[PDB]
Design a protein around this ligand. Structure first.
Ligand SMILES: *C(=O)CCCC1CCNCC1
Ligand SMILES: *C(=O)CCCC1CCNCC1
Ligand SMILES: *C(=O)CCCC1CCNCC1
Ligand SMILES: *C(=O)CCCC1CCNCC1
Lengths: 243, 243, 243, 243
């Protein structure tokens, strides 16, 4: 997380951490608890090539990474079959835990937005995670979960910004329709926050508008963060995750 | 170049090395001389973002990298307007030198192929460059120009292969029509060979079939090398390079 | 620490962690509390060149590094005047904290040995720290304090071992008299444990026999760990630390 | 070599490069040809531990490293038996080639100074090699042999300087009597130059006054280059190297 701050223990009860087996269960991507048994995340975090379930684990809301580990096995890795690369799109995936977690005030699910939700540009939203605090700048131990308020930005504005200082024809879409865009030159998600959630507060309720997907550097001018648009894939998500 | 050997100094007179300004003018991509004033390379080597032409220089055919440098400045960088990522396609670009170069039997242009050429499987083709000799394995100094004969395989065949061991739905094309694939578990190009040429001797004359574009590792099973198909972009090339 | 286990929370109340200012207050060496206002460590950890005291802080007993940080500023760095390199000897130093620390059953000083104490081979001694668990592999997060029992051996026995597989003449002392040696191929200290303590329970109480100083690799054949012999420098220590 | 220049092709005919086996015969230290069959170099380059002859090779004067390689096997590694570390002293070794070299005006032995030569402070001397051009700054390819004029300096003066900004007591020797020192804050040898020659022309004759041994940062204020004084070990050198 770039330009943010450590998050109070009572916020972001749905933030989760993905671990990969090695010398230790290292964090490699974030996720969000959208149902007692399901974690929503980015496809590029677990694909497009098939991974080994035994090498994957999920960690629920931890104030400081690795410190109070209680790793949970995964039962299924479901990646959108549309996915190949984050630039192409459909960067989204679902993880099915072996057991439903015991919902609590400290750790519980985030609410998916209704298929009609729009999330107007300018609206205050938040992105959270344990990613780098800046370009090639690792989150220092004790690894606190960070947060930062980023403004959503209309798809066409971002797509346009991405053409500024680039060779791609303006008529060629870079920021696609199944994508969402947020952040600025001082606030944004970073390497390590991938698959993490972008949440906004609407009717006095936190709805996940996006999933950290890709971009060009952390908090870079004319290169706002690109997130997988959640509303666009509700139907696919509901083919697995009970409503 | 993985596999293969050191190229005879009489071979590949069109092979060029693109250099980036830093501690020294380091090699970062390949390219080919197609006209006394033009170089063909991969768009991802110089884009999609606009870089400073002042920090770019071209080095003509060199048996050993950095040893006989005579850097040539660049006046224009023309990247196919449809490019954004090698996976999406249009991984091709043109470099106009500030002055025309003098050709000889040791250094001259490569012949582009007619729009009808397909380069069917079983076709003899070679790929050359100064890239790694294996995954995470740099070409050791004196950095000789390497070459390697690679087997050409039908797009369709390579597409299926790329779907093996992947979550990507079978009907979602990975290896696109504007692409070409060649190589196997022993022969292939590697990081640092990008933008370089893949040539095939057709009816006694070398034609450039493709440009080193991307893949998923070097000489990995079910992941053959992917090249930008030159025939697909002839019209674009001629809007800039004299016939 | 190689070949040990996480230390019980009630053990090694004198363990200290030295921190250097940078992206974050990183741990570079161990040390021990020998007085409410003094820390004993290795001179190579802070010398022979004078460093800025502002860039140095001390962390008292922590089960896991960085978790419960409560850094303490240092007012004085006193290095034995005869030190220049660990191999030559006198690898010992003292740190005077800016304020006295409150001692408790969980954090208090270690007892120094009587000038006559000669920890005979066969002495049950332990070494502790937050250093690597092997040659080239860092202690993984959450970085627990580790301990490991190590066998003490006669100086002359270790000295002869050091001459095995070396060109150094047999009569040229390698393991000096102001040094102590312990450990084998399965138990030893490592990079990051330097300055830390080696303690033996002698007649009911724990006495610090040495200061983790140097060696040739961690847990390597014929190259047992080398520690500064505390008894040798007792007089020097009392020139600065009260009773 | 820091603050130096690429050596002309006719200077330094005795400069040799030491190669260690791996992905390629990599340079790791310099040396000097003092006899048709003998190479002089620093003990620390090949000790104190016993190395395998098979893995070692010598390369005579090369304008650019790795370019015209003609690797010569070594028949015997002779390390001064008083040697353990460069700071302690006797940092000198002899390499015996399997075959005497056929000398020419372009490649030939350097002259050792007689036991009486002194090389007074402020003497015009040069150090050469292929080491770093600065602190942690590799010699960029094509790897030209560099040279720099360094001013010799009285032993007591260097020893004095090394004590400035250090805890070592003033009466404790750091720059010992079997060492010599040259250089300043702009010119000095660097990592990679080790074992290389320090030559001075006395009465129209180049004499090797020292062997690059150790120091504290390349061209650092008050930390001049320390070299193993050759005169001090003539007797040892002649126990093997015929006059
Ligand atoms: C996941 O961590 C890969 C890249 C994520 C980008 C980093 C820059 N801001 C947008 C998201
Ligand atoms: C350019 O150097 C990037 C990597 C190109 C790949 C390497 C493996 N074979 C296909 C092309
Ligand atoms: C301090 O951390 C430097 C290395 C100390 C050695 C490690 C191997 N065992 C003996 C002490
Ligand atoms: C050999 O290359 C080790 C380091 C040599 C030092 C570098 C700084 N100047 C004196 C010699």
């Amino acid at each position: 997380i770039v330009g943010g701050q450590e998050a109070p223990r009572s916020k972001w009860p749905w933030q989760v951490s993905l671990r990969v087996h090695g010398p230790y269960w290292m964090h490699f991507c974030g996720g969000s608890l959208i149902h007692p048994q399901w974690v929503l995340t980015a496809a590029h975090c677990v694909g497009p090539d098939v991974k080994d379930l035994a090498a994957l684990r999920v960690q629920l809301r931890e104030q400081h990474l690795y410190y109070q580990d209680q790793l949970l096995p995964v039962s299924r890795i479901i990646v959108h079959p549309q996915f190949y690369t984050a630039q192409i799109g459909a960067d989204i995936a679902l993880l099915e835990l072996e057991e439903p977690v015991k919902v609590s005030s400290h750790v519980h699910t985030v609410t998916l937005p209704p298929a009609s939700e729009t999330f107007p540009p300018g609206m205050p939203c938040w992105v959270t995670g344990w990613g780098d605090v800046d370009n090639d700048e690792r989150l220092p131990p004790p690894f606190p979960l960070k947060q930062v308020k980023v403004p959503i930005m209309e798809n066409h504005i971002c797509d346009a910004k991405y053409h500024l200082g680039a060779y791609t024809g303006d008529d060629v879409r870079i920021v696609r329709d199944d994508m969402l865009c947020a952040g600025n030159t001082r606030r944004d998600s970073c390497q390590g926050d991938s698959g993490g959630p972008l949440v906004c507060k609407v009717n006095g309720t936190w709805l996940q508008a996006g999933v950290v997907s890709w971009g060009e550097g952390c908090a870079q001018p004319n290169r706002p963060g690109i997130y997988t648009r959640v509303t666009y894939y509700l139907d696919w998500i509901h083919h697995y995750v009970p409503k």
